[PDB]
């Protein structure tokens, strides 16, 4: 309850959150870097021209 | 009673220290995040030198 050194629930939460946060943030951040390209924003305008 | 009074003062100090320590550990975690960010910035500067 007080959280001795290897209290299985608390220790597991720590180890999972290390993976969980790093992976998810990497994917969002690298996804925004891959999506940063100006020509891709031009592809949204192109999709507008194409549908019209 | 005299022994209890002397012991009580020591106990109060210990309790105060523990409370301070709890505040301190949280601050240390925050410091690590700040430290990590500056290191990343330094690495970027190194890349410019390579160019």
């Amino acid at each position: 309850v007080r959280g001795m050194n290897t209290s299985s629930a608390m220790s597991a939460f720590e180890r999972m959150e290390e993976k969980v946060l790093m992976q998810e943030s990497r994917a969002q951040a690298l996804g925004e870097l891959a999506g940063a390209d100006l020509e891709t924003q031009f592809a949204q305008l192109e999709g507008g021209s194409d549908v019209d | 009673k005299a022994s209890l009074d002397t012991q009580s003062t020591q106990v109060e100090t210990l309790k105060r220290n523990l409370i301070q320590l709890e505040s301190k550990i949280s601050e240390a975690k925050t410091k690590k995040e700040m430290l990590k960010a500056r290191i990343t910035t330094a690495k970027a500067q190194e890349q410019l030198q390579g160019m």
Binding site: L21, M22, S25, R26, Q28, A29, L30, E32, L33 | K36, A37, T40, T41, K43, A44, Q47, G50, M51
Partner: peptide, 27 residues
Amino acid sequence: EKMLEQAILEMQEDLVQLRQGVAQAIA
């Protein structure tokens, strides 16, 4: 050509590392 060719390969890998660092900062 040899001095120039080696440099081009090296700069690209460095850029990828820099991007990862930026992502970490963003994270």
